[PDB]
Every structure is written in C-alpha cells, then in structure tokens.
Design an enzyme around this catalytic site. Structure first.
Site, PDB file in Angstrom:
ATOM      1  N   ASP A  49      10.561 -69.282 -45.266  1.00 15.16           N
ATOM      2  CA  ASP A  49      11.158 -69.169 -46.592  1.00 15.16           C
ATOM      3  C   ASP A  49      10.632 -70.178 -47.569  1.00 15.16           C
ATOM      4  OD1 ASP A  49      12.670 -67.008 -45.805  1.00 15.16           O
ATOM      5  OD2 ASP A  49      14.614 -68.009 -45.928  1.00 15.16           O
ATOM      6  N   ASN A  94      11.268 -62.460 -46.936  1.00 12.89           N
ATOM      7  CA  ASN A  94      12.668 -62.050 -47.005  1.00 12.89           C
ATOM      8  C   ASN A  94      13.444 -63.313 -47.415  1.00 12.89           C
ATOM      9  OD1 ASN A  94      15.017 -60.418 -46.903  1.00 12.89           O
ATOM     10  ND2 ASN A  94      15.258 -60.548 -44.674  1.00 12.89           N
ATOM     11  N   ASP A 313      26.953 -68.485 -43.275  1.00 16.65           N
ATOM     12  CA  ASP A 313      25.813 -68.583 -42.351  1.00 16.65           C
ATOM     13  C   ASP A 313      26.218 -69.254 -41.042  1.00 16.65           C
ATOM     14  OD1 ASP A 313      23.150 -69.221 -44.850  1.00 16.65           O
ATOM     15  OD2 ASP A 313      24.300 -67.401 -44.381  1.00 16.65           O
ATOM     16  N   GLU A 341      19.985 -61.077 -44.135  1.00 14.55           N
ATOM     17  CA  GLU A 341      18.750 -60.769 -43.404  1.00 14.55           C
ATOM     18  C   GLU A 341      18.795 -59.425 -42.689  1.00 14.55           C
ATOM     19  OE1 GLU A 341      19.786 -63.710 -44.306  1.00 14.55           O
ATOM     20  OE2 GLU A 341      18.258 -65.246 -43.941  1.00 14.55           O
ATOM     21  N   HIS A 385      16.522 -64.666 -38.080  1.00 13.13           N
ATOM     22  CA  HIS A 385      16.509 -65.971 -37.406  1.00 13.13           C
ATOM     23  C   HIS A 385      17.852 -66.341 -36.802  1.00 13.13           C
ATOM     24  CE1 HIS A 385      17.876 -67.910 -41.480  1.00 13.13           C
ATOM     25  NE2 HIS A 385      17.959 -66.594 -41.568  1.00 13.13           N
ATOM     26  N   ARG A 386      18.948 -66.090 -37.528  1.00 15.17           N
ATOM     27  CA  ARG A 386      20.250 -66.508 -36.988  1.00 15.17           C
ATOM     28  C   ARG A 386      20.740 -65.660 -35.821  1.00 15.17           C
ATOM     29  NH1 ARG A 386      21.060 -70.713 -39.840  1.00 15.17           N
ATOM     30  NH2 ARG A 386      20.528 -70.574 -42.095  1.00 15.17           N
ATOM     31  N   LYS A 411      11.943 -68.330 -39.833  1.00 11.40           N
ATOM     32  CA  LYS A 411      12.385 -68.140 -41.217  1.00 11.40           C
ATOM     33  C   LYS A 411      12.923 -69.452 -41.762  1.00 11.40           C
ATOM     34  CE  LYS A 411      14.656 -64.755 -44.257  1.00 11.40           C
ATOM     35  NZ  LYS A 411      15.582 -65.594 -45.055  1.00 11.40           N
TER      36      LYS A 411
HETATM   37  O1  LIG Z   1      22.114 -70.302 -52.209  1.00  8.87           O
HETATM   38  C1  LIG Z   1      21.806 -70.452 -50.997  1.00  8.87           C
HETATM   39  O2  LIG Z   1      21.047 -71.309 -50.587  1.00  8.87           O
HETATM   40  C2  LIG Z   1      22.393 -69.504 -49.997  1.00  8.87           C
HETATM   41  C3  LIG Z   1      23.642 -68.884 -50.295  1.00  8.87           C
HETATM   42  C4  LIG Z   1      24.277 -67.904 -49.332  1.00  8.87           C
HETATM   43  O3  LIG Z   1      24.158 -66.566 -49.817  1.00  8.87           O
HETATM   44  P1  LIG Z   1      25.308 -65.735 -50.512  1.00  8.87           P
HETATM   45  O4  LIG Z   1      25.666 -66.447 -51.760  1.00  8.87           O
HETATM   46  O5  LIG Z   1      24.769 -64.378 -50.848  1.00  8.87           O
HETATM   47  O6  LIG Z   1      26.507 -65.680 -49.560  1.00  8.87           O
HETATM   48  C5  LIG Z   1      23.692 -68.024 -47.912  1.00  8.87           C
HETATM   49  O7  LIG Z   1      24.220 -66.954 -47.137  1.00  8.87           O
HETATM   50  C6  LIG Z   1      22.141 -67.972 -47.976  1.00  8.87           C
HETATM   51  O8  LIG Z   1      21.583 -67.991 -46.660  1.00  8.87           O
HETATM   52  C7  LIG Z   1      21.688 -69.235 -48.741  1.00  8.87           C
END
Ligand SMILES: O=C(O)C1=C[C@@H](OP(=O)(O)O)[C@@H](O)[C@H](O)C1
Length: 427
Positions: A49, A94, A313, A341, A385-386, A411
């Site tokens: 990422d 992604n 997460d 994901e 990944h998770r 990722k």
């Molecule tokens: O802003 C960020 O760094 C993230 C916000 C979250 O998403 P959501 O806001 O869609 O829940 C999280 O799930 C993503 O892995 C990272």
C-alpha cells in the site's frame, strides 16, 4: 496457488518491533508531497500500500529518496497541489489510503488524471467522496461503474459548502479534510448523519497539524476549514508502529502466552487500534502500557459482546481469538467489513466454520461459538492480508493450519510470518 502451513505453536513470548503504520505512512507521504520544505520520515512502512503511494508520487513528479530498507524517506515537498495532465493513469493496487486521499487531493486546480487499481478496488465504493468533491466544484468522471473507481479527475475543487456521507467510510471525510486547506475558498464540511471509524479522523487531524494546518472541528458533525493555506514540512517525522499489525501479536499472547511486547506504539499513540488491547483486557488478558510499548500477558479468555465500530480492522483479530475463548463472542456494528479488501463478514464467517466454529453471519455483526476442538483447514485468504494474519492464530492450538496465498500479507506487513515465528516457542 502458494500456501504456507503453520505447525502448532506451544507458547508465544518475546518482543516485536512493529513495522510502521500504514494509515500514518500514506497520510504523511501525501502531506509531505504537498508541503513546502524537505520532510524526513523514519519508521515508514514498506508494504504494497505504501509502495503504490510512492509510485504515484513518483509519477506525479515528486522527488524523494529511500533508505535501503525503505523505512526512511526524504521527500522534497512540491510546495502546493500536485499536477499532471494527459489522463496520466495512477495504478493504486487495492490501497484505499492512496485511492481516497488522492481522489480528493488531485481535484485541486486543473488536472487530467485517472485513478485505478486492482479488480477489487473497482468494487470498493467511492461515491460519497465524489459526491462531496463535486459539491465543491470538482469535475469527476466514473470510467466504469457509477460510484466506484476508476475515476477521471479534471480538477475544479474550489471549496464552499459541502456535505459528505460518513456512514460507510471515514476515509471520504479524511480525504476532504486533507484537501480543503489548499482550496482557494473556505470550506464547511457537513456530515450528513452517522460517522463510522471515527478514530481515523483523529489520525488525519493529527497529521494535518504536524504539517502546519488546523481546522475547526464541531463535534465531528461539521468541520470548518479556512482556504488558502499551505502545508509545511515538520522536518523529521517518526511514523508510529502499526497498531493494527500489533493486534495479532498481542492476541497471540492472550491465547498462548507468555508475554508479548510490541514496540513502536504506546499509551500516547494516535491510532485508534491501540484500543484493541482494551478488548483483550475485557476478555481476561493482562495488559501493560509503556511510552513506546504495549504488552499482553496470558490470563484467561472469555467471550465478549461488543460494538467494534471504533476498531474495525483490529476487530477481525478478535473473531479468530474467539475460537479460544469461553462462550459465544459477538462483534457488532461492523457493516463496512463488507466493503473493504474483501467482504470480511462473508469471508470471516466462511473460514471460521472451516475450522469447526458455529457462526452466525449477521448483516452487520458476527456471532461465533467455538468448537470443543479445532480441526485442520486450508484457509482461503481473499487477497486480504488480514484474513491471512487472523487465521495464522489458529496454529496456537493442537492443530496445524494451512494459509493460502500467504504473501497477501505484504499489503501491510511483508514480514508477518517471520515475526510470528520470532515469538513462537516450542517450550
Ligand atoms: O483512514 C484509514 O487509514 C483507514 C480507515 C478505515 O476505513 P473505513 O473508514 O472505511 O472504516 C480502515 O478500515 C482502513 O483500513 C484504514
């Protein structure tokens, strides 16, 4: 199809120095790119990422250098909005933390850029953000399915009154917050209704302040942004260790420790996922907090029934830890697992049943009743990944587990299995 088989782990104990935070890394890179001055980032995460963000910055003409291990990055700030024409295509894998922020940021001024990514990225919603950017003046075109990437950005975001839906993702608001300060007119961002994943908004505001910009937050319902601002390099900036990557190791100790200490995050961390430790404590584990570490020591493990919207997460890790808990565990208010994901509610329920659990896949919750003993399964990982890291914990039992496509962990955490092995003890 590559696979990795994990043998049973008798005990976990040790210390892990965490890889950098993906959330902080991608925000810091984009802000450093927009800022005036040279920013030196240390403990930057080296993962897919972040690599997609770095590649996008290179394509946009931003100059930077990376250390051998890719965790130190010296960025020459552009001193303003980034620009490219000719429908330059930025391929973002992604990485939602590249896609959503760049979708907004690149609407500043004139531009002609296309954002795209892997097939699954074209299935992850971005309509709420596009709606808000257009209310601010942006010209954006959906090149395939309405409300999803890929997008053709032709600029035009000047600011003004903009509403944004915060019910599906906090990332749309995050993207707007980072962009609005550089818009010529002031912006008032109004949240339509509910706001999910609220702690990520605090991460965004913290990074923006580090880079010289503050805004008026009115109870997370409305944000007042003054236009005509500039981001400024903070000089050297230390990226926090990843609190989401830490969840696996802290949970491993709660299940099979021993004591596991993760360094790089502590009680003052800005990441909402450090609250994952609170959940293990509620389950019966012992937690110790330090200035730059969090540790977990095995106690007992009892099922919990909790709203997990604040740690979506890291909450996935509780879904597999639940296999080892006494009682039925319920994780609520996690609808957006479905638009990440992979659809994580479908995926988690499907794979948990493969190792023996009885699972109710709710529309926006999951209920898990562990089996008396787990059985062997070959776990599908859905390019997530998770899913791979969560199910690695199945090996903290008497049964081995086979994880398909183990490299999907790259990722956010390329060295995940080597790090889990580091704390795995046979005695
Ligand atoms: O802003 C960020 O760094 C993230 C916000 C979250 O998403 P959501 O806001 O869609 O829940 C999280 O799930 C993503 O892995 C990272």
């Amino acid at each position: 199809m590559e696979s990795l088989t994990l043998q049973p782990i008798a005990r976990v104990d040790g210390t892990i120095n965490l890889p950098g935070s993906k959330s902080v890394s991608n925000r810091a890179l984009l802000l450093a790119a927009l800022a005036h001055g040279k920013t030196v980032l240390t403990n930057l995460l080296d993962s897919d990422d972040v690599r997609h963000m770095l590649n996008a910055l290179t394509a946009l003409g931003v100059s930077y250098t990376l250390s051998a291990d890719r965790t130190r990055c010296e960025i020459i700030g552009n001193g303003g909005p980034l620009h490219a024409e000719g429908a330059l295509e930025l391929f973002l894998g992604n990485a939602a933390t590249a896609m959503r922020p760049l979708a907004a940021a690149l609407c500043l001024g004139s531009n002609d850029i296309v954002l795209t990514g892997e097939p699954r990225m074209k299935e992850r919603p971005i309509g709420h953000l596009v709606d808000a950017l257009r209310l601010g003046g942006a010209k954006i075109t959906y090149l395939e399915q309405e409300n999803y990437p890929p997008l053709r950005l032709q600029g035009g975001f000047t600011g003004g009154n903009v509403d944004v839906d915060g019910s599906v993702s906090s990332q749309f608001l995050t993207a707007l917050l980072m962009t609005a300060p550089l818009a010529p007119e002031d912006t008032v961002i109004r949240i339509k209704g509910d706001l999910v994943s609220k702690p990520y908004i605090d991460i965004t505001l913290n990074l923006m302040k580090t880079f010289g910009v503050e805004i008026e937050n009115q109870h997370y319902q409305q944000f007042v942004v003054k236009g005509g601002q500039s981001y400024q390099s903070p000089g050297t900036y230390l990226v926090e260790g990843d609190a989401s990557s830490a969840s696996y190791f802290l949970a491993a100790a709660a299940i099979k420790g021993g004591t596991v200490k993760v360094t790089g995050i502590g009680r003052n961390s800005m990441q909402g996922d450090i609250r994952f430790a609170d959940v293990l404590e509620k389950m019966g584990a012992t937690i110790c907090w330090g200035d730059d570490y969090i540790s977990c020591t095995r106690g007992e493990l009892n099922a919990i029934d909790m709203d997990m919207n604040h740690i979506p997460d890291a909450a996935m890790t509780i879904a597999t830890a639940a296999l080892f808990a006494k009682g039925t565990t319920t994780l609520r208010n996690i609808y957006n697992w479905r638009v990440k994901e992979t659809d994580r509610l479908f995926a988690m329920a499907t794979e948990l049943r493969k190792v023996g659990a009885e699972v109710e896949e709710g529309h926006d919750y999951i209920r898990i009743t562990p089996p008396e003993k787990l059985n062997f399964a070959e776990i599908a990982t859905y390019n997530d990944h998770r899913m791979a890291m969560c199910f690695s914990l199945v090996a903290l039992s008497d049964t081995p587990v086979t994880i398909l496509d183990p490299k999907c962990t790259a990722k956010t955490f390329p060295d995940y299995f080597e790090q889990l092995a580091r704390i795995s003890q046979a005695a």
